[PDB]
Amino acid sequence: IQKVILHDVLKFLFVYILFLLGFGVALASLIEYGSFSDAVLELFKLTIGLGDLNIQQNSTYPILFLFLLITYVILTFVLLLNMLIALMGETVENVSKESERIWR
Amino acid sequence: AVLIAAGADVNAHAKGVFFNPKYQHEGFYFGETPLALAACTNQPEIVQLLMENEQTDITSQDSRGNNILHALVTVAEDFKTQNDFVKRMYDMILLRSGNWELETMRNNDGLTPLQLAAKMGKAEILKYILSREIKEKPLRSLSRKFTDWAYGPVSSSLYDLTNVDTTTDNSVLEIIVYNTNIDNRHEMLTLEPLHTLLHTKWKKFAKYMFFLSFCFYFFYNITLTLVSYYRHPLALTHKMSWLQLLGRMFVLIWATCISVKEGIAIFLLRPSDLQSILSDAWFHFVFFVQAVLVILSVFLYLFAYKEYLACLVLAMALGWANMLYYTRGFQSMGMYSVMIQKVILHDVLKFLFVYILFLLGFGVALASLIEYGSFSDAVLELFKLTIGLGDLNIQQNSTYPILFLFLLITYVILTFVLLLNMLIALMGETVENVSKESERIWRLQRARTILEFEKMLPEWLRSRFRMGELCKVADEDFRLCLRINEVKWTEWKTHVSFLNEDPGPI
Amino acid sequence: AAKMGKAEILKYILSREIKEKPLRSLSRKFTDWAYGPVSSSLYDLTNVDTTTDNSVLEIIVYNTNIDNRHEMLTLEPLHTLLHTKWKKFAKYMFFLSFCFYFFYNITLTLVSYYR
Amino acid sequence: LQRARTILEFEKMLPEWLRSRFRMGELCKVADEDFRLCLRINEVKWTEWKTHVSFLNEDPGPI
Ligand SMILES: CCCCCCCC/C=C/CCCCCCCC(=O)O[C@@H](COC(=O)CCCCCCCCCCCCCCC)COP(=O)([O-])OCC[N+](C)(C)C
Ligand SMILES: CCCCCCCC/C=C/CCCCCCCC(=O)O[C@@H](COC(=O)CCCCCCCCCCCCCCC)COP(=O)([O-])OCC[N+](C)(C)C
Ligand SMILES: CCCCCCCC/C=C/CCCCCCCC(=O)O[C@@H](COC(=O)CCCCCCCCCCCCCCC)COP(=O)([O-])OCC[N+](C)(C)C
Ligand SMILES: CCCCCCCC/C=C/CCCCCCCC(=O)O[C@@H](COC(=O)CCCCCCCCCCCCCCC)COP(=O)([O-])OCC[N+](C)(C)C
Ligand SMILES: CCCCCCCC/C=C\CCCCCCCC(=O)O[C@@H](COC(=O)CCCCCCCCCCCCCCC)COP(=O)([O-])OCC[N+](C)(C)C
Ligand SMILES: CCCCCCCC/C=C\CCCCCCCC(=O)O[C@@H](COC(=O)CCCCCCCCCCCCCCC)COP(=O)([O-])OCC[N+](C)(C)C
Ligand SMILES: CCCCCCCC/C=C\CCCCCCCC(=O)O[C@@H](COC(=O)CCCCCCCCCCCCCCC)COP(=O)([O-])OCC[N+](C)(C)C
Ligand SMILES: CCCCCCCC/C=C\CCCCCCCC(=O)O[C@@H](COC(=O)CCCCCCCCCCCCCCC)COP(=O)([O-])OCC[N+](C)(C)C
Ligand SMILES: CCCCOc1ccc(C(=O)CCN2CCCCC2)cc1
Ligand SMILES: CCCCOc1ccc(C(=O)CCN2CCCCC2)cc1
């Protein structure tokens, strides 16, 4: 658990906040807002798994109000999380031969 | 030997088309002399027999301008094919000559044998030339590596930096970095006078110029966000003498200084290739896009054009994507961003083409039990379902109940069990192959950074940040050298070659 | 040897070079010229090309019994004989078959969507 | 193995006047009155140094 938090998880968080505060303030275009508390929260609730689509219905533009919402889902799910699993597999493979001595 | 001692000419020049081919399989370029042919086909006893003759002109030039030492560089290959002999023919011919006439000669491209091995990507001839130590007594000025002192298992050497540093145009360090043709550049930047010459540039000036470039681009995106969030936003055309008026000015000035600077570097750079944009000049375009969109949004507003808010959100949302560029100052975060590139190219672009084939395949063809405006709506009810939310009023208001799952189950089996789980299975294979190369392919990125900070320095400041020391390596031979220390426990010999009897730093 | 899947006897026969003087017509691989480390050879295509019925290239491809077919198609006159067919005619017939089946699904969708 | 079965089915649906134009091979003279239909492949080899006795042409090159 120690080798995964140091070598893998702390680098994931810096890249994700760069998009979460990147997209988050810059969503207040088709709906404006108090954006930094709210439009950041509507992109974090969407990442947990719940979602509220009344803001897409009450948008200035319909289906075009998916391009900043699709580009968020492509990066954070396909790209960033699946590359975390690909690096934890490399990290477990190197520490499994040393974990008996570094425990003792 | 019968023919030569009967009057045969030893200075012929085969000027044919077969000996000067256009393509590799149509002929054999060897150097157009009887001495280049005996050397390039591994016949060392005829090479000695031809140089002991007195009519042999060892300093002649053929149709390309090449001489005997340019010709051996051209036919040189790896260890897996030729195995030794070009490196052993190079110094047999060099030591017999006995001076710097062959090594300092320029062909019709204007290159020496040192610069031609770097232009063509020969990493085994170049390893030989840069660290060439000749320990004999009458021929020691033909060296590029000296020994300053030694005591026990402790030595101190002196490399030579005459054409391998960036004090002259078209040098060995510059050629390797800007060379888009060859593909083993990150195995030629680990060689011994070149590895330490980039490491010293980073600690003296180039890590401080890289922090100042990061602060000013960080403040450019904060100021562009705050004046656009607290609302036309920019340039404040109605003066109320407001303090912190610089924020509307600083965004406008700095967006012109990028667009001019990237207008040049796009115009000069053209290695015309699809591999060029994906590897070197991706960020030369996408800093030029943003600097246009800030300026063009101001020019739209001044007449009536009303599209002055579309560009500003594009200029802000792109302006935060670009700041992953600045991760290459740290080894930890830099190598991580390298593997983002290899995953987007090799894994993600192929996933998207197969998924849209089902998303527009199922999507229009769902309008059967519910009809619809299907292409906007029934496509959206299959993309909302993939995000994670779902709306089941259309299944209740279907023509057929539970049968309205077969096109909805066949969608979930493919996109979750099959397609996504095979993406993870391929990223594990892709990370495993690039993890051994990511340290060198990162250093090829940072080496191009250092050599562009050096060009934007005035001449009084180039002189202060400069490596090298004038040593005395022979009788009136003063060179500009670079000292590297070493500890070696395996070869025990007595020391005869040294520039100083008394060791130590002094 | 191709019907039964013997990839070591078949490697021997297809590239059989006999350099002796009285028995050289028993070869299936000749040397046209050579100069230094550069040569140019000539394979033989008498029963291994598809100009006759029941040939060596046809037998290996349509052979469902054996299981090492993809190790018999990498042998030296057969690897280059398929690569040349693809560049002359077979990559252009494969694009024309893709366009017409693409237009068949677009037209079948639009006439069924706009009822 | 998938693409090789594709090529050999496109070849069957060609008329006989068009088979003749797309055809590999060249009539060589490999012995006394032995004309065969051959396929030329080039090679570069740096490891075996021998002198050449077997060759159909003294004068090399494409011609
Ligand atoms: C805040 C979110 C909640 C998370 C919990 C709070 C976290 C608080 C933690 C704070 C500091 C972390 C613990 C100490 C780390 C020291 C070095 C280390 O071990 O890292 C190693 C891995 O490489 C990395 O982890 C790179 C660090 C990522 C930089 C992003 C900023 C901080 C990340 C934090 C969060 C991102 C959020 C970004 C928001 C601004 C470096 O490799 P090494 O094995 O040490 O090799 C020697 C390197 N050396 C030669 C240079 C010495
Ligand atoms: C001695 C003190 C006085 C010396 C003054 C001499 C004058 C020297 C300078 C002269 C001119 C510099 C050119 C910049 C032009 C304006 C800004 C601009 O538009 O360019 C660019 C920024 O470029 C930078 O701002 C980098 C910082 C360079 C300044 C050097 C600091 C002083 C030199 C002393 C150093 C010693 C320090 C160590 C001391 C121990 C903007 O583009 P970018 O996107 O930000 O760049 C990314 C490139 N990319 C697009 C390819 C991705
Ligand atoms: C114009 C923006 C593109 C958007 C769609 C994509 C279209 C084309 C896509 C093609 C996919 C395959 C090619 C990917 C790029 C080349 C490889 C690469 O460098 O990967 C980089 C991707 O880094 C990023 O993700 C940021 C760059 C912009 C992408 C959009 C991010 C969110 C934008 C928000 C919305 C804005 C919407 C746009 C507004 C108009 C990572 O680079 P690196 O390895 O970490 O650093 C070293 C790189 N080097 C060695 C090359 C120097
Ligand atoms: C649009 C969705 C948003 C995504 C962002 C926008 C993306 C815009 C990007 C556009 C072009 C991509 C960047 C340049 C790639 C050049 C070659 C390359 O590096 O790929 C490599 C990986 O192999 C592949 O990636 C295969 C490509 C998939 C084909 C699907 C169509 C386009 C994919 C895009 C999206 C799918 C959607 C489909 C909708 C129609 C090929 O391997 P290689 O290492 O180069 O080896 C040399 C190969 N060679 C010998 C032939 C030279
Ligand atoms: C662990 C580290 C990361 C933590 C998670 C990040 C999220 C943390 C979540 C909340 C943090 C704050 C808690 C209270 C919530 C808001 C109140 C507030 O003061 O916000 C102020 C800033 O909001 C703005 O001014 C919007 C403009 C963007 C600010 C600059 C861009 C930042 C991007 C670069 C950042 C540099 C670092 C980037 C790192 C790569 C004002 O808010 P407001 O606009 O007036 O509306 C809300 C006010 N209300 C509630 C009263 C209605
Ligand atoms: C230049 C690059 C070429 C591509 C075109 C990209 C441009 C955009 C693409 C399609 C837009 C279609 C029309 C909208 C723009 C017209 C202006 C407008 O009035 O709309 C408004 C919204 O404007 C926006 O902010 C756009 C919506 C999302 C922001 C950008 C993401 C879309 C980029 C997708 C492709 C990226 C590139 C694809 C490859 C990565 C702005 O003005 P407003 O009406 O005052 O504000 C509405 C609120 N109010 C009415 C209540 C006040
Ligand atoms: C978005 C949220 C941002 C929040 C922060 C996120 C952080 C990260 C995210 C992104 C940032 C990633 C890169 C930026 C860091 C700088 C570049 C760098 O490599 O750092 C270097 C130091 O950097 C320094 O120079 C130390 C600072 C003190 C002196 C600098 C003051 C200006 C120059 C003064 C003169 C003024 C001009 C002349 C006037 C007389 C690293 O050095 P190190 O770490 O100590 O050791 C590592 C080993 N290494 C060196 C081989 C790597
Ligand atoms: C990045 C690339 C992929 C992008 C994502 C894909 C989805 C992009 C999402 C939206 C894209 C368009 C945006 C506007 C929304 C619809 C408006 C419109 O003009 O659509 C028209 C086409 O719709 C039809 O005519 C339905 C019949 C199917 C079309 C042909 C099959 C396509 C499959 C093969 C495709 C070849 C390529 C396949 C690649 C492997 C008419 O629409 P409508 O039927 O009248 O109802 C909607 C009209 N309304 C809103 C006014 C009510
Ligand atoms: C201010 C909030 C900072 C929290 O920063 C993170 C938020 C979410 C994540 C996630 O990874 C989302 C979890 N996600 C994982 C995969 C399946 C569904 C849930 C990571 C960092
Ligand atoms: C016009 C829309 C094009 C977007 O094209 C994609 C949509 C979704 C995905 C996904 O991969 C869904 C994300 N999914 C990942 C696993 C857990 C839950 C979220 C990929 C491409």
Residue numbers in the entry:
A (entry chain A): 579 to 610, 622 to 693
B (entry chain B): 232 to 462, 471 to 610, 622 to 756
C (entry chain C): 348 to 462
D (entry chain C): 694 to 756
Report text from the authors:
TRPV3 is a cation-permeable TRP channel predominantly expressed in skin keratinocytes, implicated in cutaneous sensation and associated with numerous skin diseases. TRPV3 dysfunction has been associated with numerous skin diseases, including atopic dermatitis, dermal fibrosis, rosacea, and itch, as well as channelopathies like Olmsted syndrome, caused by a growing list of ‘gain-of-function’ mutations. TRPV3 is inhibited by the local anesthetic dyclonine, traditionally used for topical applications to relieve pain and itch. The structure includes an ion channel, which is formed by the transmembrane domains (TMDs) of the four individual subunits, each contributing the S1–S4 and pore domains in a domain-swapped arrangement, and a large intracellular skirt that is mostly formed by the ankyrin-repeat domains (ARDs).
We used cryo-EM to solve the structure of TRPV3 in complex with dyclonine, TRPV3Dyc. For each subunit in the TRPV3Dyc homotetramer we built an accurate model of residues 118–756, excluding the regions of S1–S2 (residues 462–470) and S5-P (residues 611–621) loops that were not resolved clearly in the cryo-EM density. We found that dyclonine binds to sites inside the portals which connect the membrane environment to the central cavity of the ion channel pore. These sites are formed by the transmembrane helices S5 and S6 and have not been previously shown to bind TRPV3 inhibitors. To make room for dyclonine in the portal, the side chain of F666 flips around by about 90 degrees and its benzyl group becomes nearly parallel to the piperidine group of dyclonine. This conformational change does not propagate to the channel gate, which is formed by the S6 helices bundle crossing and maintains a similar conformation as in the closed state. However, we think that it is more likely that dyclonine inhibits TRPV3 by binding in the side portals and protruding into the TRPV3 pore’s central cavity, thus creating an additional barrier for ion permeation.
